[PDB]
Every structure is written in C-alpha cells, then in structure tokens.
Amino acid sequence: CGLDKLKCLEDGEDPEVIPENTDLVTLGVRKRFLEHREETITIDRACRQETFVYEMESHAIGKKPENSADMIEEGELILSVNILYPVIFHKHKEHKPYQTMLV
C-alpha cells in the first residue's frame, strides 16, 4: 500500500500547469477552461469564484491559542451556523446573504 503505487505526481511538480500525460475527463474540461483564458484580454490571476473562505481558513486552520484557557476541549462539538443579513436581495431565492459562524 505504499504511496509510490499511487503518486502519479512527483513532489517537485507545480500545480499551476495541467499534466498532459493523463486520460482524465476532468482534466480535459479543465484544459478547456484554461485554454480560453490565456489571451492578453483574458489572462489574469484574479478571483476564481470567491475569496473569503480560504482567507479565513488559512488564517486560523491548524493554529493553537496563546492562552491555556482558550483551548478547545478534545472531542468538542463544532457547530456551523449561518446568520443572514437584514438586507435581503428580494430578487433571488436560490442564494442568500449570510455569514457563517463557528461555535
């Protein structure tokens, strides 16, 4: 069960380029997405679809507190709560204006 049997990618390979030596339909669709975004009018490193989630994940994921009293108990429940804003679009119903709080 060693990883040499599974690691088609070497540890020194960047994720910014699609490996052409693949048979994946997913990577084919990814190539279709990337090819039409390489022109001077379309090439950029802007937001993909959203930014907030990773920014507030990496800012806190895997970190530990500076005080002992602020320690999460082992096995403590983590609850994800979405709080909607008072200013609703009142034009769309699929998506909502909300902020997600972890308690």
Added chain:
DNA sequence: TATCCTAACCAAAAGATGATTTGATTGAAGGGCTTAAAATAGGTGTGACAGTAACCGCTCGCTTCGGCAG
C-alpha cells in the same frame, strides 16, 4: 516605489426594461328551467277523520292503656 482614483472599459452584484410564456379570467354556447292558459287520461298514499289509549300565633276535640275498683 505601495497604493489609489475612476476618465473609459472588463467581471460581477443588483437594478432595471421590453418580449414572451403560463396562471388566471370569461364570452358564448351545450343546457335546461320558469308561470300562463287548456286538456283528457289516469295510478295510490296519505293524511285527515275519528275513536279509544296510555302515561304521566293561639285555643278546643278526639283517642288510648293502665291503676285502682268490683
């Protein structure tokens, strides 16, 4: 420079503008009436009739069962 404004333009939220599709309304017609009359021909149930029926504060008079009489 690190960073920004926001003229003119690109990506996305929202904010809006007219053409088209679907939920909803209805105009007209199938239909099935009305009393008004005049008429012969009719069937019986039923609803009066009638009957029994039943159910639903003070002061006198009168009486008895023993304690001596005979």
